[PDB]
Each structure stands twice: as C-alpha cells, then as structure tokens.
From a paper:
Norovirus [name] displays an icosahedral symmetry that is composed of 180 copies of a single major structural protein, the [name] protein (VP1), which organize into 90 dimers. Each VP1 can be divided into two major domains, the N-terminal shell (S) and the C-terminal protruding (P) domains, linked by a short hinge. The P domain is further divided into P1 and P2 subdomains, forming the leg and the head of the protruding P dimer, respectively. Expression of the S domain alone formed smooth, thin-layer S particles without the protruding structures, while production of P domain in vitro resulted in P dimer, P particle, and small P particle. Functional analyses showed that the P dimer and the P particle, but not the S particle, bind to histo-blood group antigens (HBGAs), the host susceptible factors of noroviruses (see below), indicating that the P domain is the HBGA binding domain.
Residue numbers in the entry:
A (entry chain A), B (entry chain B): 226 to 527
The structure:
C-alpha cells in the first residue's frame, strides 16, 4: 500500500539545500531546463542523480586540505572524500559525489578543521560552483577564504550557509548544472530533465529562500520533492502500480480536499495551474495518496 | 505494527545538532546527569522537551535584529520568533522554543539577513548559551560578530556551525542545560534525565563530532535517538505494546546479527556494556525491531 508521510509544508525540508521548505510554488519555467540532481528519487525508492538520504548533507563538502593554490591568495585546494568518509570514486554511475551542489553560483559557507590532535579552526569560505576548476566528480574543489588560518593536510569540512551575490554572470543560477568534472570534461549519468507533459499542467515545486551573504537575491531554491518524501520512498520501496500516484492536498481543519496533484513515478509532481506564483494554503494542509491513475488524468485547477 | 527505518549509522542525523551521526558510543556517564532536551520523543510519537521534527532546524534561531547592545562592541540583540515565524510564547509547555540549544557553550555560526527588499548580508556570529543574558524562553538572545555589517530591524537568521572554545569557564558542556528563562529563572517542562536501571546496562548514544571554530575540542555531541527515529515515531504514533522494544543490530553483508539493544518506551536505548567507548560495527549494519519485551529482558554484552 503506497503512502505519503503526513507533513505540513512547514515541516518539510528542502532536498537541494539543508533548510526548511518555505512554500509551495509553481512556474511555467519558460526557457528553462529543470534538471536538478539533488532531491531526485523515483516513487518506488530509487535514488537518482547525486541524491542521498541524509537531510543535512546536501551542499556539504569534506576532504583533505591539500595546499594553498600557487599564485592565488588564500585559495585552498581540497582533495574530497565522500561525505560519509568513503573515498571519491570517479567510476561511480553518478554525475558527481552524492550531495554535490547541482547549481552554479558562489556558494557561501564555513570551512572548518579539526587537527592536529583536537585543535580546531573555522572561517568563512566561498566555493564557485561555476568555475573551470570545480571538479567534484574527481574530488577537486577549491574554496576561497578571507582567513589564512588553515592547516595543510588536516581534515576539512565545508558547511553550506547560502549564496553570495557579486552582481555578475557568476550569479546564482539554480537551474544551471555545474560541470561536475571541470571545464575539460562533460557531465554524465544525470537524472533526466522533467517537464509537465499534459496541457494546462505545471510542475509543483517545494521552494525555500536560502540565506544571502551579499548582494540582492531572494535565494529561491526549488526542489521537486521535499527530502522527507525522498527518504520515505527510499524506505518503503513500494512498487508503483501506475505511472501516476494521484494525491489530494487536504485540510484536516475542515476535512476536505484543497486540490489534487499528480505524483509521477519518476519523482515529480504536477498541478493544474498557469503562471509563476506561490501556492499558499491553510497551514495544516498535507498531501495524501488517493489512487493510481494514468498520465492523462485531468486535474481540476488548483 | 511497530517499525523503525532501515538506516546505516552514517545515514543517521544527530538530533541535537544538524550534522550526520559519526558513531555509536556508550558510557557509564559517571556523575553526569543525562538530560538532553532535543531528540526526545517517546516511541509512540510524543515529542518531549524542545524537540521538533525538522532535522535541519535544531540549534537555529530566527528573529528581529532589535539593536546593538549599548556599551558593547558588535554585540547584537535579537528578538526571537519561533523557527516557524510565530511569536515566542513563554506560556508554552516547553522549556524554551523548539530547537533551542540544550547545552551551554559558545555556539558558533553565521547570522544572515534579508532586507530591506532583497538585499542580503551574513557574517560569523557566536552565541553564548551559558551567559546570564541568554533567555530564549522569552525571546531574548544576543550574538557577537566580528562585523558591524548588520541592519537593525531586519529579519535575521542564525545558522549553527559548531562550537568556539575560548579555553575558560564558558567552555562547551554538552550535558549542562542552559537557563532557558535567563539567569533569574528555573527551567520547567524539562524532558526527564535518563539512566540505565538494569544491572550491566549502559545507555547507547549516537555521537557526532561537531565542528570546532577555535581552541581544542573533540566536539562530542551525544543524542539518545537519531532524528530519523524521532521523525518516524512522530509519523507512526504506533502504540507501545510493552515498556521495551527489542532491537537487533544486523549485518546485511553476512546475514548475521551483532548485538541487541533495548529501546525504552520513553525514548532512549540501552545495551549490555561496561565502560566508555565507541561501538564500531560493520558500516552496512542497522537496527531491526524484533519483539516487545520488558525492562528485565537480559542482553548479551556487546
Ligand atoms: C560582503 C560585502 O561586503 N559585500 C559587498 C556588498 O554589500 C553587501 O550587499 C549589500 C546589498 C548590502 O546588503 C550590504 O550590507 C552587504 O555587505 C556591496 O553591495 C552594495 O552594497 C552597498 C552597501 O552599502 C549598497 O547597499 C549597494 O546598493 C549594494 O550594491 C548592490 O549590490 C552589489 C552586489 C551589486 O549588485 C550592485 O550592482 C548593487 O547595486 C558590493 C558592492 O559595493 O560589494 C560587496 O559585494
Ligand atoms: C579563531 C581564532 O583565531 N582563535 C584564536 C585561537 O586559535 C585557534 O585555536 C588554535 C588551537 C588553533 O587551532 C588555531 O589555528 C585557531 O585559530 C588561539 O589559540 C591559540 O592558537 C595558537 C595558534 O595560532 C596555538 O595553537 C595555541 O596553542 C592556541 O592556544 C590554545 O587554545 C586556546 C583556545 C587556549 O585554550 C590556550 O590556553 C591554548 O594553549 C587563542 C589564543 O591565542 O586566541 C584565539 O581565540
């Protein structure tokens, strides 16, 4: 029996950045390819892209502080491990290491170290996921920091915080996939792009406004499934009885349905709507499974 | 029926700090009162203390940047809201706001703002959860920052990163509860201290090594239940058929089991062990629910 966990929008976690979901949101996505690599799981529990189940790991990095890069002030070279400590293995059937950012921008966070012994230090750091030498697929990532207080050959962790806007082309683009293998290699093993195929339908996104560390940005980060759904599908591994799980968003306060959504087998939701806008609903509302239908099922407008 | 999710230790999230669990750990906890307020839930789904379900929210704060504290350089007064945006209500049946830190120390992180408009800024911040002024229960919390780039009367978020060790009395003590009401107040609505009551048993902890930002610290943070168990019990609300759920740590690699543990109804686990030490197990190992036993069920040592 297929189920969805009972969660208010305000209890959901974004699957593309480690923060709560702020609102549901829908868009025409005009002139945009929606192909996020985090928050990708089929409803029968297969993880795609760089998707992992830990809800606090996405956009984090871990590894050895190999050296300060020659000829650049306080730019530091990491030799990544996987976030669980296992070594990076570029033969993996993934675009890059699990949890790797799936967007281009100036990722702002903090680089911390423990070592030698139990000595520690941390400072503000920035990773440009759009730069030529950003190549997490093979464990090669650099971070800039304003501090020189870092030890070489000590275990180092990058904790993501938000985006840093300089006001340029290096500006946060949530839909532009990074080149996981650096400027000299092409991406492989990507989770496929998704789009609404039925007329009058749009994708339903779970949107957070991630912190901004500089410049003007609303920090919009849209995921196709909250992390809790990813986790649940992975746990249940229930077999999809059809291409579409029909869901009802219900308001427990009144006992009635607010709208319907098509949860597609491959792990995204559509609703009947038009335009770019938030979907603001009674705080207590939640999705529940109604029935298995086909991809041609017709939804009533949200 | 009662279940627990299938999770490797490395897939678990600490329920007292938003980072993955690093290892299982057990201790005599000699002359220590084990009374964490985060990651507290009964196995039938009742959340206790300051425990919330979101796995990315613990140790975060949200609030208005009221002003800079007079006569003190770059110390800033927050007027907290709840993490959900609602006003702080000191009459809540909680020791303090959900997700509030449950230890005393120099909590290191980043304070960010968005406003006016979509202008943003973020800088390192430290909050001393042990200072007299720390009074989250009534929404009064201060943070120190090395930057003066903060706007008064703009929405402010504190994202936790780790602990800052000055090497003095304000040093991290994971088992010392803060005075949630501030220096002139006694705590209330506390989740109870826990201990092994059966001879030969000790509590099984889920330990993380949280980042240190300065000084010497192992950053040891022990929780009674991974956040995933908290979330599961909350979702399931299954009736506890006895006082103790018997769990077995199984190794899927071999099909053989390694040890058993008693999951007590009030939300902590014990094992038959003696001494302070990590419990290292094959990395693919996980807990499985076996039976409903009582508090006198006798376990083979680990
Ligand atoms: C970290 C840092 O110092 N960054 C600055 C940046 O200021 C930051 O962001 C602005 C918007 C504000 O929130 C500051 O508190 C914050 O530190 C600078 O941006 C300009 O900041 C000044 C600050 O007085 C004005 O607010 C100005 O309007 C900002 O310019 C805008 O944002 C820039 C990033 C550009 O996009 C520009 O076209 C915008 O008008 C910038 C430039 O001075 O420098 C660092 O990035
Ligand atoms: C952030 C910061 O600058 N804090 C310093 C702190 O240095 C930090 O901690 C040490 C252990 C090391 O990891 C540094 O890289 C890190 O920035 C200072 O601590 C001293 O630092 C020097 C190195 O610059 C030595 O390592 C020295 O042993 C450190 O003192 C020890 O740690 C202190 C926290 C005290 O407990 C002291 O008794 C220890 O001997 C301190 C003191 O200089 O000042 C800032 O806080």
């Amino acid at each position: 029996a297929f189920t969805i966990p009972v969660l208010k929008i305000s209890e959901m976690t974004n699957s593309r950045f480690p923060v709560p979901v702020d609102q549901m949101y829908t868009s025409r996505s005009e002139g945009i390819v929606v192909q996020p690599q985090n928050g990708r799981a089929t409803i029968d529990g297969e993880l795609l892209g760089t998707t992992l189940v830990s809800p606090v790991s996405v956009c984090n990095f871990k590894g050895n502080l190999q050296a300060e890069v020659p000829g650049q002030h306080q730019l530091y070279q990491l030799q990544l491990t996987n976030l669980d400590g296992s070594p990076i293995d570029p033969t993996d059937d993934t675009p890059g290491p699990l949890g790797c950012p799936d967007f281009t921008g100036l990722l702002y966070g903090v680089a911390s170290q423990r070592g030698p012994g139990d000595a520690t230090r941390a400072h503000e750091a920035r990773i440009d996921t759009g730069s030529d030498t950003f190549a997490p697929k093979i464990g090669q990532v650099r971070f800039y920091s304003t501090s020189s207080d870092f030890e070489t050959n000590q275990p180092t962790h990058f904790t993501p915080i938000g985006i840093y806007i300089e006001g340029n082309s290096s500006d946060f683009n949530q839909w532009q996939l990074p080149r996981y293998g650096g400027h000299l290699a092409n991406n492989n093993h990507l989770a496929p792009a998704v789009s609404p195929l039925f007329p009058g339908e749009q994708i339903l996104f779970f949107r957070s406004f991630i912190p901004g560390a500089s410049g003007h940005t609303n920090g919009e980060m849209d995921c196709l499934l909250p992390q809790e759904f990813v986790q649940h599908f992975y746990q249940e591994a229930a077999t999809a009885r059809s291409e579409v799980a029909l869901l009802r968003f219900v308001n427990p306060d009144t006992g009635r349905a607010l709208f319907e959504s098509k949860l597609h087998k491959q792990g995204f939701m559509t609703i009947a709507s038009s335009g770019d806008h938030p979907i603001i609903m009674p705080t207590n509302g939640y999705f529940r499974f109604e029935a298995w239908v086909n991809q041609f099922y017709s939804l009533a407008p949200v």
